[PDB]
Design a protein around this ligand. Structure first.
Ligand SMILES: [Cl-]
Length: 131
C-alpha cells in the first residue's frame, strides 16, 4: 500500500532514488540522505505519483527520457507501477509508455534516460523499502 513513505532501491548499483532540491534526479548509496524518502500515491489503478517528502517535488520524465523533479503534479509525473519478480517494481512513464521508457539508474548513480532503458536491465528494477 501507499500510506508510509518508501525508499526505492535500485539493484543496478545499489542506489536509492533521490530527488534533489534543484530538481536533479539521481541515485545515492547513502541510506541516510534526506532526499530519498518518497511518498507514493495512487491515481488510477497501477498509476502512481512519486513525491519527495522533503521538498514536495514530484518525480517526472522529460521529452528526452530524463528524470527531473517537478514542482507540480503534471502529466509528466504519472508512472505505471508494475510488480516484477522478487518484489522489485518497474515504473514506466505514462506519457511515454508506448515507447516503454522506464525510470532507471545507472551503476554510477546517474539517471538512465528512458530511451536507453529496456525490460531486463537491473537499472529499471526498484525495491520499495521502509524509511
Ligand atoms: Cl543515459
Amino acid at each position: 500500500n501507499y500510506k508510509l513513505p518508501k525508499l526505492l532501491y535500485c539493484s543496478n548499483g545499489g542506489h536509492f532514488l533521490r530527488i534533489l532540491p534543484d530538481g536533479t534526479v539521481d541515485g545515492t548509496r547513502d541510506r541516510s540522505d534526506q532526499h530519498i524518502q518518497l511518498q507514493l500515491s495512487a491515481e488510477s489503478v497501477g498509476e502512481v505519483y512519486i513525491k519527495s517528502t522533503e521538498t514536495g517535488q514530484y518525480l517526472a520524465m522529460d521529452t528526452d527520457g530524463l528524470l527531473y523533479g517537478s514542482q507540480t503534479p503534471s502529466e509528466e509525473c504519472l508512472f505505471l507501477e508494475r510488480l516484477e519478480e522478487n518484489h522489485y517494481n518497474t515504473y514506466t512513464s505514462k506519457k511515454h509508455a508506448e515507447k516503454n521508457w522506464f525510470v532507471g539508474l545507472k551503476k554510477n548513480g546517474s539517471c538512465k534516460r528512458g530511451p536507453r532503458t529496456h525490460y531486463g536491465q537491473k537499472a529499471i528494477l526498484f525495491l520499495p523499502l521502509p524509511v
